[PDB]
Design a protein around this ligand. Structure first.
Ligand code: GDP
Ligand code: K
Length: 308
């Protein structure tokens, strides 16, 4: 009868595994985590239930030393181990920091395997800070292009955008958590969509329609209360300052609105218009509604945007 979607989040390389570690700390049920690295010492500290050391013959348990070809060969030589860990997933999020050796080279191989295994495959990757220099940025760009060829949808977070949301004292780790929220809240928004039946119900097949073989994507969530809550939640959903791909130009959108018994038709249209006017395109919308009576004055808008 009913379908149960298996979501897996895969961290590849140092930055991706720290995202996984921090997401596990935050708490994420129903999602399964996989940690993939050449660096055996970092893998030893991973909180992920499923750990895969790749490239031990190539690196002797060290990182890739910024050589993406070593990350790529390490992933290819552990293909069977990667397939075994993914097998059964309906959706896979591959998160990695681009510009080093393991993420840049291995993350596109992991994404390709996930897609070959039948999983809807989303990449969420960072680009390096400009202060890391041009060779790092150029390697990262080759990684991004390789990711884009391997995934169904790709979200790119330029680390330079973190400098737009900090003050001179913000701990680096606090900035990194802001970047993690892009992946965490996207995963959580899909999980929630999949676990609850809506009054206007969207399910994993709608996620597939909007994300499959699409390229660049935006995933966002917004929460507001009071008057203008619908407009404010929709603006929050689509307005992250950390994204390379904004909502502008979107041609397909999956939008789900969750609220209490007070959720009004009028405000549902307001939220939908905010998104479609922001896109500045004729948006093919997949619209859903959930009534959670536990919510009183709160409204949550979830947006997945593709078709750029
Ligand atoms: N936002 C963020 N970026 C990171 C993090 N760790 C590393 N990076 C970035 O990701 C790039 C690659 O670093 P790393 O993942 O350790 O390299 P690799 O393990 O050899 O692939 C760096 O050049 C940084 O720009 C992190 O925790 N958060
Ligand atoms: K549903």
């Amino acid at each position: 009868g009913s379908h149960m979607a298996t979501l897996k989040v895969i961290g590849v390389g140092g930055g991706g595994n720290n995202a996984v570690n921090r997401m596990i700390d935050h708490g994420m049920n129903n999602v399964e985590f996989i940690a993939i690295n050449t660096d055996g010492a970092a893998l030893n500290l991973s909180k992920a239930e499923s750990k895969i050391q790749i490239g031990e013959k190539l690196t002797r348990g060290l990182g890739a030393g910024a050589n993406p070809e070593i990350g790529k060969k390490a992933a290819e030589e552990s293909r069977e181990q990667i397939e075994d860990a993914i097998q059964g997933a309906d959706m896979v999020f591959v998160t990695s920091g681009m510009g080093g050796g393991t993420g840049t080279g291995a993350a596109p191989v992991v994404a390709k395997i996930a897609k070959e295994m039948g999983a809807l495959t989303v990449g969420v990757v960072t680009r390096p800070f400009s202060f890391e220099g041009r060779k790092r940025q150029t390697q990262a760009a080759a990684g991004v292009e390789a990711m884009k060829a391997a995934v169904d949808t790709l979200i790119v977070i330029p680390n330079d955008r973190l400098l737009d949301i900090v003050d001179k004292s913000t701990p680096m780790m606090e900035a990194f958590k802001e970047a993690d929220n892009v992946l965490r809240q996207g995963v959580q928004g899909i999980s929630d969509l999949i676990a609850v039946s809506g009054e206007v119900n969207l399910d994993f097949a709608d996620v597939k329609t909007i994300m499959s073989n699409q390229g660049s994507a935006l995933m966002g969530i917004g929460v507001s209360s009071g008057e203008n809550r619908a407009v404010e939640a929709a603006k929050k959903a689509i307005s992250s300052p950390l994204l390379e791909t904004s909502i502008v130009g979107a041609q397909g959108v999956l939008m789900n609105i969750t609220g209490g018994e007070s959720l009004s038709l009028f405000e549902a249209q307001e939220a939908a218009d905010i998104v479609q006017d922001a896109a500045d395109e004729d948006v093919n919308m997949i619209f859903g509604t959930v009534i959670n009576p536990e919510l009183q004055d709160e409204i949550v808008v979830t947006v997945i945007a593709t078709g750029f």
